[PDB]
């Protein structure tokens, strides 16, 4: 963002010194300057590079993810999952909850992912090699048994689901009327928390086959990793709920 402002300031100071704005010796460059500041002003070049990379697209092991299926899901079991962001010295990166609303039923999923660089110390203790997958399995079983403790009947899953077949990308402004609103023959909604459960942050995206306050994604990568099985941080600015 700073490159844009610095180059803009460059050209404009370059043009303002055109007091002899004549002979097309100092007016010509003046025209080109005032012209470029317009095209430099940052929602147009972005789709330029986007389409370029998109048409180019027409041809790790630091992150493991565990995903939980619970049938009778509800916001009554929200604190139990926002707690598991940071406890037992394992610092889950982000916790994600997804529903498919194709037909009438909302097929629920919890998505838990653990990096390896910021909790390298703990994983280094379980063995000299790094038991990432096994450890993540263990925390997942812990969530399973604590959640069944409450009463909901949960199931570990690995062939989880698909919001993009393995098609409309929208990320919302922040609040509740919408998540009660969400159409078409298929609905994929995805909630995800992160950021220090001392006070958490979250981003939300949804996919179906502008309703109230949605926004499309020109340029899809954002749908490619909308499935829970994905190990990615769900691009988008965070909100303190």
């Amino acid at each position: 963002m700073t490159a844009r402002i610095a180059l803009a300031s460059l050209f404009v100071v370059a043009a303002v010194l055109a007091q002899p704005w004549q002979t097309t010796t100092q007016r010509w460059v003046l025209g080109v300057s005032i012209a470029a500041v317009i095209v430099l002003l940052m929602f147009l070049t972005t789709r330029i590079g986007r389409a370029l990379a998109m048409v180019r697209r027409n041809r790790d092991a630091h992150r493991a993810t565990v995903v939980l299926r619970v049938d009778p899901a509800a916001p009554a079991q929200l604190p139990v999952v926002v707690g598991y962001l940071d406890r037992y010295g394992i610092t889950c990166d982000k916790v994600r909850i997804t529903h498919r609303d194709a037909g009438g039923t909302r097929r629920s999923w919890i998505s838990l992912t653990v990096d390896a660089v910021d909790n390298l110390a703990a994983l280094q203790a379980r063995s000299a090699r790094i038991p990432l997958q096994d450890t993540t399995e263990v925390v997942g079983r812990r969530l399973a048994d604590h959640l069944r403790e409450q009463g909901w009947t949960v199931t570990v899953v690995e062939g989880v689901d698909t919001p993009l077949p393995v098609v409309a990308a929208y990320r919302v402004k922040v609040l509740d009327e919408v998540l009660a609103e969400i159409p078409a023959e298929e609905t994929w909604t995805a909630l995800e928390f992160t950021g220090s459960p001392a006070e958490p942050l979250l981003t939300v995206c949804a996919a179906v086959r502008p309703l109230a306050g949605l926004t499309p994604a020109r340029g899809r990568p954002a749908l490619a990793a909308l499935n829970p099985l994905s190990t990615e941080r769900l691009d988008g600015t965070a909100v303190p709920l």
Binding site: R126, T135, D145
Partner: protein
């Protein structure tokens, strides 16, 4: 609600079996907390191999107000050290 007895740190008792079948000896500690509507929590254990490395990160706190102190003095020391030299190297020519 459903309150029942439980040995500490374990799942509560089964309501229709006597304590003498679960193995209650005279002198245990039993808790009147609710009943699990689900699993009895077999408390999955994972093995540890190098438990020393867990503490060594606990002591190794972050940047914190500790690395400020080293920067504090190591700044102050150099300030004095140039302070004298400047004045007397001012004098190594004139004064």
């Amino acid at each position: 609600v459903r309150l029942s007895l439980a040995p500490i740190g374990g799942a509560p008792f089964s309501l229709d079996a006597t304590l003498d079948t679960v193995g209650v000896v005279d002198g245990d500690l039993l808790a009147l907390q609710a009943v699990p509507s689900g699993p009895p929590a077999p408390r999955i254990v994972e093995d540890i191999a190098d438990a020393a490395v867990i503490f060594s990160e606990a002591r190794r706190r972050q940047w914190g107000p500790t690395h400020i102190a080293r920067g504090a003095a190591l700044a102050l020391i150099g300030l004095i050290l140039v302070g004298t030299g400047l004045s007397v190297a001012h004098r190594v020519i004139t004064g």
